[PDB]
């Protein structure tokens, strides 16, 4: 996510090979935090309507 | 490891000689079990007739000693 953006913006650099450890970015909280579900639900909602697409387009071209 | 071999179809046919070292090799392997099941239904009696079938286009690929 960061390397591709750097290669696109600053150019003069290339990314090689295919992704070898597929994972995700997540909001971290203390163990058994009571409002985990809230956040998770919100994140899922942000994936559904349009929010993550807008955030991708606006920031990481 | 080709996906045409590891994902068999009725259309594609590859086989080897019956009761040979290759038959044992595919029997032993667990991750090659689907390949063995596909191969066993079309296995050939001898290598020479397998070569003739390959030239005939009845059999697409033949697995045998180098």
């Amino acid at each position: 996510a960061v390397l591709e953006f750097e290669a696109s913006q600053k150019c003069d650099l290339v990314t090689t090979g295919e992704l070898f450890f597929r994972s995700g970015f997540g909001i971290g909280m203390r163990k058994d935090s009571p409002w985990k579900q809230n956040v998770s639900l919100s994140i899922l909602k942000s994936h559904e309507n349009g929010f993550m697409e807008d955030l991708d387009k606006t920031w990481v071209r | 490891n080709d996906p045409r071999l590891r994902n068999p179809s009725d259309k594609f046919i590859y086989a080897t000689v019956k009761q040979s070292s290759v038959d044992i090799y595919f029997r032993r392997q667990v991750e090659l079990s689907t390949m063995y099941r596909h191969m066993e239904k079309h296995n050939y009696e001898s290598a020479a007739e397998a070569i003739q079938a390959v030239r005939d286009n009845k059999l697409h690929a033949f697995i045998w000693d180098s």
Partner: protein, 652 residues
């Protein structure tokens, strides 16, 4: 002049049993005019048996004899074989203790017991162990004669199998009345195997089971298996026998005495009829014990050979050269909570069908116990991930690296008592993940498919499909092509995604270039209406409905089904765009002969989510399974599964 004698030896109402019919009009359906003769041995002592049989032979000159007695009998089978060797008359023992197989039988003797040997019972019991994946068993054995043959058969069957059986230990006991009781008790408290196999007579079985109950080997953490010998009168089992005992018997189980007599007379009559058809005449009647016909009398040998292989009413009655029933259909019976011998499974031909997909276990108080580590997993067929097949007919079971699965038992497919469930075998990506989870988290599981709706959609406030099964506690967890979304994550819990996916567009070979394109958002913008649709009752349909009202209202016209059919409609030209899941659309593009393409090079996955393992809300397994999935992702096993299951031809 065919004459068939029936001898009744059962020490119950024998006179009521001999008088039961004592007729000639019976056995009419037979291809012969039977001529029966009841002699009913009064008390079954050696002198009485010998004298009555000799008197019958020297009076009626019968062609064959059918013998019947009680189950407590031990040594009568020897005497009958002795008589058959001395007089060269074909006998046929049915029911009771006279039906236990003697393996060597006086080479020139036609005894023909109607029972099954010890090795075949061992084979059936070992296949029962295979079905529930029970290994590491122990053997209990008394000093009963023939125990060496039992142990050798156990070792041979364990050695000559595809599975890797692991015998733990074999213990020999006395199990005799009024003897050392400290020795048996001490030895029984040292065994810890979860599966125990015993071999002893009825009284010894009762003694052993009483001692085991004292030794705490009867509760739900111990399953016992015994052959026919340990059993007695199946109608009235003793109180010493623990609930959940398993044994294997023939079809003669639960049959009445008159039916058994009819079957024996029918076998003899059909043998004589075959002999008459082959040689044009009936076999010679038997002689008498006051002689010794040394010569083998090849006519009698031919009659015996004809009597060996014979079928009746669609059932195989072939006899091995060792004088016992070869390849008969057998039933596996168990002692249920009501303390009755319920029949559990069957052994038709070389394949095993059993009623219970999972073995029940009851507490010492006859309270149904359920193992906390046994998860019930619901799933559904999805070609890239879940594939169902019928088991291989040749080997009975199916190919390894394929987990057995059952189809929902709402509709009973028992057709009597065969099997109430369709037994298939499931394989693929999701099943591989489930097997890895079972190995890592160390839990056991069954697997059943969902026949009530697709993955899941709320209809009239209720949930169907996998989400319905999990939410209503019918299953512990759901695995398969299940997408994580808010409406499901509110009602149930979800695990960490193990394969990423989303909404993707499939077209036939970049005309659209975007899900939010004006072509889709405005169906009537230009050209006649765009023919794009999706499979209803899924996450994609709900996403489209909740986000783009115009999209959903147009999509109702093209309510596709059977994604393969949608794909072929795209190929023919009835459709130009297909909206579906990215994980399956990439696979469908990969194994395409025309190499259909997703809208953008990487599909520009919309509403990116993942496949998760559904669970009951606020469960316990969630944390452990999440950590196990994260470990699998970390060690690259998921990448290996992607390479081995979701590879494509023209994807590179």
């Amino acid at each position: 002049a065919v004459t068939v004698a029936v001898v009744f030896g059962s020490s119950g109402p024998l006179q009521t049993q001999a008088r039961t019919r004592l007729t000639s009009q019976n056995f009419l359906d037979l291809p012969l005019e039977i001529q029966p003769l009841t002699v009913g041995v009064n008390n079954t002592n050696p002198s009485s048996i010998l004298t009555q049989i000799c008197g019958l032979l020297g009076a009626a000159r019968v062609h064959g004899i059918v013998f019947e007695d009680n189950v407590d009998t031990e040594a009568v089978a020897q005497l009958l074989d002795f008589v058959s060797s001395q007089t060269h008359v074909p006998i046929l023992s049915i029911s009771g203790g006279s039906a236990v197989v003697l393996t060597p039988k006086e080479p020139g003797s036609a005894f023909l017991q109607l029972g099954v040997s010890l090795e075949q019972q061992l084979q059936v019991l070992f296949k029962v162990l295979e079905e529930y994946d029970w290994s590491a068993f122990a053997v209990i054995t008394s000093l009963h004669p023939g125990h060496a043959l039992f142990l050798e058969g156990v070792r041979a069957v364990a050695d000559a199998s595809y599975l890797s059986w692991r015998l733990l230990d074999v213990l020999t006991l006395e199990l005799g009345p009024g003897g050392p009781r400290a020795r048996t008790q001490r030895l029984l408290r040292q065994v810890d195997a979860p599966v125990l196999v015993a071999y002893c007579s009825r009284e010894e079985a009762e003694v052993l089971f009483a001692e085991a109950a004292q030794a705490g080997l009867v509760g739900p953490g111990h399953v016992w298996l015994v052959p026919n010998l340990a059993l007695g009168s199946t109608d009235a089992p003793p109180a010493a026998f623990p609930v959940g005992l398993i044994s294997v018997v023939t079809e003669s189980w639960r049959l009445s005495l008159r039916q058994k007599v009819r079957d024996g007379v029918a076998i003899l009559a059909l043998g004589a009829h075959s002999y008459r058809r082959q040689y044009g005449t009936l076999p010679a009647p038997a002689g008498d014990c006051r002689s010794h016909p040394g010569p083998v009398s090849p006519a009698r040998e031919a009659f015996y050979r004809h009597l060996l292989n014979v079928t009746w009413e669609g059932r195989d009655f072939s006899f091995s050269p060792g004088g016992y029933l070869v390849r008969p259909t057998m039933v596996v019976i168990a002692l249920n909570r009501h303390r009755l011998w319920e029949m559990v499974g069957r052994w038709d031909h070389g394949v095993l069908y059993m009623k219970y997909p999972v073995w029940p276990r009851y507490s010492t108080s006859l309270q149904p116990v359920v193992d906390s580590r046994h998860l019930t997993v619901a799933t559904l067929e999805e070609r890239p991930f879940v594939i169902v097949e019928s088991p291989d007919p040749g080997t009975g079971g199916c190919v390894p690296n394929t987990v057995p699965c059952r189809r929902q038992s709402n509709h009973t497919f028992s057709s009597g008592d065969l099997t109430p469930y369709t037994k298939l075998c499931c394989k693929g990506f999701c099943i591989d993940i489930l097997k890895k989870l079972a190995k890592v988290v160390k839990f056991s599981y069954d697997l059943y498919l969902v026949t009530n709706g697709k993955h899941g959609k709320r209809v009239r406030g209720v949930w169907n499909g996998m989400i319905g099964e999990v939410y209503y506690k019918r299953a512990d967890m759901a695995i398969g092509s299940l997408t994580i979304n808010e409406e499901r994550s509110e009602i149930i819990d979800f695990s960490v995604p193990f394969v990423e996916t989303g909404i993707s567009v499939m077209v036939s070979r970049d005309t659209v270039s975007g899900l939010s394109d004006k072509k889709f958002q405005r169906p009537q913008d230009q050209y006649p209406p765009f023919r794009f649709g999706t499979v209803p009752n899924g996450s994609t349909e709900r996403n489209i409905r909740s986000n783009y009202r115009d999209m959903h209202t147009h999509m109702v016209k093209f309510n596709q089904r059977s994604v393969e059919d949608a794909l072929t409609s795209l190929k023919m030209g009835k459709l130009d765009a297909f909206i579906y899941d990215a994980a399956v659309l990439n696979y469908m593009a990969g194994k395409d002969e025309g190499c259909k393409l997703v809208t953008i090079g990487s599909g520009k996955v919309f509403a990116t989510t993942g496949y998760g393992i559904a669970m009951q809300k606020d469960s316990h397994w969630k944390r452990a399974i999440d950590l196990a999935l994260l470990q699998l992702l970390g060690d690259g096993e998921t990448q290996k599964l992607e390479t081995v299951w979701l590879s494509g031809i023209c994807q590179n």
